[PDB]
């Protein structure tokens, strides 16, 4: 209702980690990943760390992780679904080839334009096409025009979580044979672990059922083959069969 | 030579993980990788986890990330130093093409012959070209040898670990351009985030410190780009920038 709003600080999961300790989260940043983050990623993560949404910032070495991956199966075209303030957009648009190109979706512009300064300053802003949108819409359209030509070779789905399998059913047509779909936060906290978690807010409750949902449609859907990997909040990669 | 016992029982660190949660481990395996596991790799696992050396075998979370690379980035030939009883191997030997090619290294072929009669069933194990030796002196005659046209896509080093940097000399010679080295248990049980770490085996604590240096070099070597991931013991991904 009316008041003050929606404050990372009513979810109770937000200081939670999947790894031993903190100490250990923070040698890898410190040893393997701020050393190879780019300027306008570092400037762009420290302007977001203090926003009201930091919790859902995509993990610095989930990052250079990202980057890898677009690099090592030579993606050229992807989508993004869940921009934020840009941390995972910038990546991919600084592993990317100059000719690369990015189709980004979100409902807030606002949180993109404040990483849209450190992306120009990187030199990378012409690989992006922002959509403002709910991004089920927008891939709907997508089925309708798209040509095998202009399939992804990779998606970025960080979006609103309960809606993953929805995109789901849409990315699998949209991604290209042997394409890659990565879905974020596939741990959620470690909750997915529990059938039951004690004091979650209604939000994050609804998260750890359909990921706990989601994780056992993905291991048993015959048109991907799928890794989960315990890295940030867990992700799920998923290579498209036929 | 003489002194005190280094089996895997005289060792500390077995049980330790690098995720908090011994029930978030079960999860992703019960939920996302037995359900995607190759009866030939379930198979050799279950023999292996019962061998006195169990400890070394590689994660099976991890094992299917590894197939995930080796597809996206559409490898055929690859290199794998530390084979153990196969697991890594096979996993790799099914991932690639018919015709892909793996050059494996360990210096007793006895354990790889536990896992071979898995391997067979599998129908793979003409991809395979096993040499019973120390990896150093292959590496050093590959470079004698090799011409650019047969560079290596891949390499996963899991062998003696406190030889990874000297491995890495040569390995960024044999894998191509843009190909990937894969170095494995860079986390080496959480202990690199310590810069002491009481109660070890000295051959634990040998390791210890070998990463801690290797995890520094490879964060400032120009020749690779990296990502550390924290996934099984930790691994860390490098990508041969020329
Ligand atoms: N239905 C929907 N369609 C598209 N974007 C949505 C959406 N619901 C929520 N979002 C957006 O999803 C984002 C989740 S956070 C994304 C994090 C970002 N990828 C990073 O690298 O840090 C938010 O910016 C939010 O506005
Ligand atoms: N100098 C050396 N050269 C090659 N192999 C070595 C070596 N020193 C030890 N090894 C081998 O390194 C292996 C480490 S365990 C390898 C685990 C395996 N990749 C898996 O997927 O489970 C052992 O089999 C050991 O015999
Ligand atoms: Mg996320
Ligand atoms: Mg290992």
Redesign the interface.
Known sequence: GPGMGASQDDYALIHK?????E??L???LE???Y??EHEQLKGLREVTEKHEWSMALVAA?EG??L???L???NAKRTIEIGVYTGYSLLTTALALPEDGKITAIDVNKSYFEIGLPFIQKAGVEHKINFIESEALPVLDQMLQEMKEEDLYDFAFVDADKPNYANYHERLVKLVRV?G?IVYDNT?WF?T???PEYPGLHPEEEECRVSFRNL??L???DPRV???????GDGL??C?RLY
């Open positions: 980690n999947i790894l031993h300790s100490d250990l923070k040698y890898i040893t393997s990943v050393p190879r070495d250079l992780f980057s890898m991956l690099k090592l199966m042997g890659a741990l470690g997915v672990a529990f994780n056992k993905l291991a048993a083959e799928i890794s989960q990997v315990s890295i799920t990669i290579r």
